[PDB]
Each structure stands twice: as C-alpha cells, then as structure tokens.
C-alpha cells in the first residue's frame, strides 16, 4: 500500500522555566519509531519501535546531533517569532514543524510535506513543488525571505526526495511484518434502548491498523451523516486503533440501519446490522 514518514517537532517556550523544550517524534504511517526530548535527563534519540533498534550507534548519534542542533535553532526561532509578532517576553509560545514524504503503493515518491505552525496556526509551508513557500502572514514572510535567501527550500527538497524516501523504504522493509501489515477491524453492533421509542445502535471497530478507517451508518441505504455520532479514532496502545459510530433509531426500525466499514485490512468492505 501507500506509506509515509513524518517527523513532528514541537518547540515550546516557557519564560521563567528554563529554555524552550524541543521534542521530535518520528512516524512511519501510524507507528511512532523514534523520540527526542530536550527535557530528558540525558537527551538522546531513543527508539520507540522494535524494528528501528537494529540501527547502529552511527544512526543514533546522527539523529541526536540533528535534534540537539535543532533544539538550539528552535530556541532562536522562538525568539525571532516573538519579535515578528511584537510579543512580550512573558508568554509561552510554540513552533511546530511537520514534515516528511509520501510513497505510493509502488514505493515511488508521491509528494513531500514540510509545514510549520506558530501557536497552532499555519505559519509557513513548503509548497508541493518543494521549491517555493506559502507564508501565512507578514511575520511568516520574514521567515520566507530569510529561507529564500538561504536557499532553504533546496535543502528541504533534497531531503524529501532523497534521504526521506530512502530511509522510509528502509524502515518499511525492516518493519515489513508490521508496517506493511494491515490489521482489519474486529466489528460488532451494540443495541441500547434510550427510551421506549428509541434505541442506540453503536457500530464498533476494534484492533485495526492503520488508523485510517471509514465507519458509517445508513438508514434504508442512505448515509446518516448528520444523525451519526462518530468518535475520534483512538489508539488502543497495542499499535491498533478503535472507533465507533452511533445512531439513535426508532424502536422497531433497527433493521433499516446498516453499518458500513471500510478499512485497508478488510478483504471486502463490511456491512453490519444489529443482530438481536
């Protein structure tokens, strides 16, 4: 199938409580495989998936250097953005960066991503061309010009088309038994009366990987989008995810409702009804 690698950087200032914390986590699809936290007693890149542990000291030191240097640069960046927004030294602020590469089912580069946010709002993003920037406001324009002057996009592009794809493919092979394994949801429909004239039908999907899933209720074959309560897909803690979708239906109309489940792991899309 398709696969992606993403690194997620969060740099948080905390005036009066030391220097900004920098954390980086790395993912292949919905599997975290690496973390770095500047607040660790001994900050270093740590494995978070078994298939990465086989990487040698050279890898871990390389990562750690990268993250240590980024930690320092993000502190500078936080100072800079505080200035770009004329903000006081009093407040806490956060820069986030998410970046990585997407591969199609053939393992070829689909596209790269490199997006940054400040205080949870889009700040600057590398365009799909991996050559130009979109800046959210006049503050981000300062970064854009600075990055344009430093030919930063060229660096991002080189990585995204190069090492990003090459290491992603490596991880995919090394962790193929899990990373390239889709686990289908285990499903069931529950029924709970809410009153004498209505009952809740809840469609459950459990134990699936990756997290991407479609769970919908139909009434007489029509999507019940507005009437469906759909909880956010949530991690079980064993790599797998869970989701449910619920609808409240007139008592005696239960068989008019069907739950439809789409997931990469299913040999065929599922259609479920409550089974009294």
């Amino acid at each position: 199938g398709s696969h992606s690698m993403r690194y997620f950087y969060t740099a948080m200032s905390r005036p009066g409580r030391g220097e900004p914390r920098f954390i980086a986590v790395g993912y292949v699809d919905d599997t975290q495989f690496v973390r770095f936290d500047s607040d660790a007693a001994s900050p270093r890149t740590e494995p978070r998936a078994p298939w990465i542990e086989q990487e040698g000291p050279e890898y871990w030191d390389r990562n750690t250097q990268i993250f240590k240097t980024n930690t320092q640069t993000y502190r500078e960046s936080l100072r800079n953005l505080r200035g770009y927004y004329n903000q006081s030294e009093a407040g806490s602020h956060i820069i986030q960066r998410m970046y990585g590469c997407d591969l199609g089912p053939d393992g070829r580069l689909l596209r790269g991503h490199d997006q940054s946010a400040y205080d949870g709002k889009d700040y600057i993003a590398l365009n799909e061309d991996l050559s130009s920037w979109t800046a959210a406001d006049t503050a981000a324009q300062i970064t854009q010009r600075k990055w344009e002057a430093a030919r930063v996009a060229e660096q991002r592009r080189a990585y995204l088309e190069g090492l990003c794809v090459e290491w992603l493919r490596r991880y995919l092979e090394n962790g193929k038994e899990t990373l390239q394994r889709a686990d289908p949801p285990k499903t069931h429909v529950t029924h709970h009366p809410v009153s004498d004239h209505e009952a809740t039908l809840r469609c459950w999907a459990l134990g699936f990987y990756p997290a991407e899933i479609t769970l919908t209720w139909q009434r007489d074959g029509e999507d019940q989008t507005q009437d469906t309560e759909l909880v956010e897909t949530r991690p079980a803690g064993d790599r797998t995810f869970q989701k449910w979708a619920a609808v409240v239906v007139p008592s005696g109309e239960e068989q008019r409702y069907t739950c439809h489940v789409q997931h990469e792991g299913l040999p065929k899309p599922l259609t479920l009804r409550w089974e009294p």
Partner: peptide
C-alpha cells in the same frame, strides 16, 4: 531519518 543538518548554518525561522 530526520532532515540532516545542512552544510553551513542551520537556518532559523
């Protein structure tokens, strides 16, 4: 692997 450090100065925002 995350983005490697550039040859020169890592560019801040």
């Amino acid at each position: 692997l995350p983005e490697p450090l550039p040859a020169g100065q890592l560019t801040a925002y």
